[PDB]
Design a protein around this ligand. Structure first.
Ligand SMILES: [Ca+2]
Ligand SMILES: [Ca+2]
Ligand SMILES: [Ca+2]
Length: 231
């Protein structure tokens, strides 16, 4: 026999590691049961449980059930700029009332990024110019360089941008005449010969999408590139 109140009733490493999504509702359960040997509730508790290093009171303990809750009434657990909370580390202090001993059990909460932000274009519209003698294959727009196009505050794939020309019902030949062969630059290339005398102006719908790993979680935004033909 050893009297081991305040020890974990589990193997694995000493730290308890869990994951939640950013923007989880108030009262989200982080840990169902800490599995600390002893009884914190009731007539004669054997242990006293408390939280140390609980910066900004993001975590709350029900000591009877050894349940940890997310405390976010009137705030958002946001992983994206400007809040940038990627994890939460707190210490569950256990005091053994009978022997006067104290121990910390660490709890690492990893905050997973959600695709909660869309690509947003820096300008309402873009403009390019092409001489009608420009050869097919020539790059006629690079206006997205230096983050002058779409940006996405999410992290990793959720924040990475792909640029794709859409069919424009107001200008049907525009998506036949220009292409984005490299969807990560959004540089626009001429696909067909121009003729000032037939058409002086094109309206090119460009859609930016983020690269979320689940296709039906992807967010998208639209801009118009106006292309003017020069003679
Ligand atoms: Ca967010
Ligand atoms: Ca996010
Ligand atoms: Ca995103």
């Amino acid at each position: 026999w050893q009297y081991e109140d305040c020890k974990l009733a589990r193997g694995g490493p000493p730290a308890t590691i869990v994951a939640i999504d950013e923007e989880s509702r108030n009262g989200t359960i982080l840990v169902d049961n800490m599995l600390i040997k002893g009884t914190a509730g009731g007539p004669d508790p054997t242990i006293e449980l408390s939280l140390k290093d609980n910066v900004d009171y993001w975590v709350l303990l029900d000591p009877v059930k050894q349940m940890l809750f997310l405390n976010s009434t009137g705030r958002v657990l946001d992983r994206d700029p400007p809040m940038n909370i990627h994890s939460i580390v707190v210490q569950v202090q256990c005091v053994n009332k009978k022997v006067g001993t104290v121990i910390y059990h660490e709890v690492r909460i990893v905050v997973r990024d959600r695709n909660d932000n869309s690509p947003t274009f820096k300008h309402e519209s873009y403009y390019a110019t092409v001489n009608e003698l420009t050869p097919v294959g020539t790059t006629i727009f690079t206006g997205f360089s230096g983050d002058n196009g779409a940006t996405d505050i999410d992290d990793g794939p959720n924040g990475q941008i792909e640029y794709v020309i859409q069919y424009n019902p107001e200008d049907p030949t525009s998506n036949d005449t220009f292409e984005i062969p490299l969807m990560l630059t959004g540089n626009v290339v001429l696909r067909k010969r121009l003729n000032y005398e037939d058409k002086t102006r094109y309206y090119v719908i460009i859609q930016a999408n983020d690269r979320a790993q689940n296709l039906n979680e992807r967010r998208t935004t639209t801009t118009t590139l106006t292309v003017d033909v020069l003679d």
